[PDB]
Structure formats: C-alpha cells, structure tokens
Design an enzyme around this catalytic site. Structure first.
Site, short mmCIF file in Angstrom:
data_model
loop_
_atom_site.label_atom_id
_atom_site.label_comp_id
_atom_site.label_asym_id
_atom_site.label_seq_id
_atom_site.Cartn_x
_atom_site.Cartn_y
_atom_site.Cartn_z
CB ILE A 142 -0.90 0.05 1.25
CG1 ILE A 142 -2.13 -0.85 1.14
CG2 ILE A 142 -1.28 1.49 1.58
CD1 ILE A 142 -3.09 -0.71 2.30
N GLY A 143 1.98 1.17 0.80
CA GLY A 143 2.87 2.33 0.97
C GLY A 143 4.05 2.04 1.87
CG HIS A 144 7.32 2.14 0.82
ND1 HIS A 144 7.95 0.90 0.84
CD2 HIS A 144 6.73 2.26 -0.38
CE1 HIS A 144 7.73 0.29 -0.31
NE2 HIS A 144 7.00 1.11 -1.08
CB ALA A 148 9.70 6.67 9.49
N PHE A 149 11.01 3.66 7.99
CA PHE A 149 11.43 2.26 8.29
C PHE A 149 10.18 1.37 8.44
CB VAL A 201 6.45 -1.83 4.24
CG1 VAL A 201 5.80 -2.03 2.89
CG2 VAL A 201 7.92 -1.53 4.07
CB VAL A 202 1.15 0.30 4.76
CG1 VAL A 202 -0.27 -0.01 5.21
CG2 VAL A 202 1.79 1.34 5.68
CE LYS A 224 3.18 3.16 9.50
NZ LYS A 224 3.66 4.22 10.41
CG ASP A 260 5.62 13.74 10.05
OD1 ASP A 260 5.93 14.92 9.71
OD2 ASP A 260 5.89 12.72 9.38
C1 LIG Z 1 4.03 9.04 6.19
C2 LIG Z 1 3.06 9.07 5.09
C3 LIG Z 1 3.05 8.07 3.99
O1 LIG Z 1 3.19 8.34 2.80
N1 LIG Z 1 2.89 6.81 4.42
C4 LIG Z 1 1.70 6.16 4.73
C5 LIG Z 1 1.38 5.02 4.00
C6 LIG Z 1 0.21 4.33 4.28
C7 LIG Z 1 -0.64 4.73 5.30
C8 LIG Z 1 -1.92 4.02 5.56
C9 LIG Z 1 -2.35 3.80 6.89
C10 LIG Z 1 -3.56 3.18 7.17
C11 LIG Z 1 -4.35 2.78 6.09
N2 LIG Z 1 -5.58 2.22 6.04
N3 LIG Z 1 -6.00 2.04 4.77
C12 LIG Z 1 -5.03 2.51 3.99
C13 LIG Z 1 -3.95 3.01 4.76
C14 LIG Z 1 -2.73 3.63 4.49
C15 LIG Z 1 -0.30 5.87 6.02
C16 LIG Z 1 0.86 6.58 5.76
#
Ligand SMILES: *CCC(=O)Nc1ccc(-c2ccc3[nH]ncc3c2)cc1
Length: 240
Positions: free
Chosen positions: A15-17, A19-20, A22-23, A39, A118
């Site tokens: 889903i994403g990254h 600070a150290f 991954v999601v 996470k 943040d």
């Molecule tokens: C620090 C910001 C960033 O770009 N990272 C990030 C990635 C993914 C999430 C996140 C958290 C919870 C969630 N629930 N459904 C989708 C998500 C994505 C947060 C911050």
C-alpha cells in the site's frame, strides 16, 4: 500469507512506505470482506481503545523481537495529497467540511494529551462509503508541514499540530505551501532567520478563513492559537 491475530496479508499487496515501515493490504482470516492495512515497522497503546470516525482505528498490534505489526482500518479513497493533486485547490465550503472532521479527531487526541507531530496530506486518508470522510493515520520525507519549533529541535507541544493544520489548509486554499523550500535545510534556515512570518493570503479569502490561517501560521508557538480557540473558531461554524 502471514497472520496477525485474526488477520492475514501478503507482502505482494504493498500500500505504501513510511519511516522504516511498510503498509500491506490484508483481511480478516474469517470475514474476507473486512479489509485492513497492516503496518510492518522495523525496530532496526491507548490507540487500540482510542475510537473516532475521523481516526484510522487500530484493530490489533503485535511486537516481535525486531518487528512491530499494526492492523488498521482500511481506507479506500487514497490520501489528501492525491486529492489535492487532482483538484489543485478546494472551495472554502469543502475546506470547512474537511477541517470540521480534523478538528473533531484532534480534540480527542488533545483530550488524551496525544500530539501527532507529523500531520501532512499523505497521513490524512479519505474514505468514500462532499460525503468524503477524512481519517488521520500514524497517530513521508516532506518537511513543509512541520512546525518551526519541531524542525529547529526545540521543546514543542500540541501547538505543533496547529501549525501543520494551518499549512495543510493554506495549501488546500491556494494549491501551494505557505513557505516553499527547495530543501529541508533551506526551510530550517528560513525559519532560523525569519523571527516573524506573514503568509500571503489571497484577498478573495473570507475574513474568518484569513483570521484562522493567520492565528495558526504563527512562527512562535506562544503567539499561535491554542486547541480550544481552533476547535471553536468562527470559520468552522460559518454557513456554506
Ligand atoms: C508518512 C506518510 C506516507 O506516505 N505513508 C503512509 C502510508 C500508508 C498509510 C496508511 C495507513 C492506514 C491505512 N488504512 N488504509 C489505507 C492506509 C494507508 C499511512 C501513511
């Protein structure tokens, strides 16, 4: 397929990254309908019970020896960063609807003495069933939203979040950050040399939104409005 309590996920569904961190996208092992974000934090609270419609719920957590896993509410709409990139700017009425939701979430966090530190568009997530619901997450890399006292390594408080909200609302209104910098170090030097800051607010801005932005975007936290002033600001109750 890996599991955390009653939840599962594959490292293939990134889903994403952060600070150290991954999601991954995952799901309830029994109810495959209930989607979650998992996470994974590399080592290298009250949150579980903390509950609000404008806060990403924590369903479960698990500390291992070198790793920590948070199972969070899945938000389907992407983040404010993506929305703002698409729309470029938002109307005052959309800003007001967004800000009412953020203010509610922040009031609960302020109640429990929690400070985000943040807040930024990539941590403000959208959920479609405006009817758009915003949810704050992480209660990256971009320093434009950090309060001056934070980027200059001082003794900050809850007011640091009020600076961040000010910068986010300013970018919602104008399409740009109020104090733009090629680099962090530049932004850090700008705030070092400028003991006073006046953001440039478009003259077309409503008087209540102008007043709110000037009260949030105060360089010195002693001059910055406090949480109660923000929560009850006339902009948040003005008519569309
Ligand atoms: C620090 C910001 C960033 O770009 N990272 C990030 C990635 C993914 C999430 C996140 C958290 C919870 C969630 N629930 N459904 C989708 C998500 C994505 C947060 C911050």
């Amino acid at each position: 397929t890996e599991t955390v309590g009653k939840f599962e996920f594959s490292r293939k569904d990134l889903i994403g990254h952060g600070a150290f961190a991954v999601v991954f996208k995952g799901r309830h092992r029994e109810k495959h309908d209930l989607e979650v974000a998992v996470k994974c934090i590399n080592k290298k609270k009250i949150l579980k019970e903390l509950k609000h419609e404008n806060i990403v719920a924590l369903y479960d957590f698990q500390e291992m020896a070198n790793s920590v896993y948070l199972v969070m509410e899945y938000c389907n709409g992407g983040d404010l960063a993506d929305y703002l990139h698409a729309m470029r700017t938002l109307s005052e009425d959309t800003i007001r609807l967004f800000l009412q939701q953020i203010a509610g979430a922040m009031r609960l966090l302020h109640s429990k003495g929690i400070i985000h530190r943040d807040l930024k568009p990539q941590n403000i997530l959208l959920s479609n069933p405006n009817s758009i619901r915003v949810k704050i997450a992480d209660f990256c890399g971009s320093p434009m939203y950090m309060a001056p006292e934070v980027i200059m390594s001082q003794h900050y408080d809850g007011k640091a979040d009020l600076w961040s909200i000010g910068t986010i609302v300013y970018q919602c209104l104008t399409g740009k950050a109020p104090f733009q910098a090629s680099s962090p170090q530049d932004l850090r030097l700008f705030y070092e040399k400028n003991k006073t800051l006046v953001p440039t607010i478009p003259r077309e801005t409503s008087a209540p939104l102008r007043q709110l932005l000037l009260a949030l975007l105060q360089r010195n936290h002693k001059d910055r409005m406090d949480f109660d002033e923000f929560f009850h600001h006339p902009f948040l109750d003005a008519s569309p």
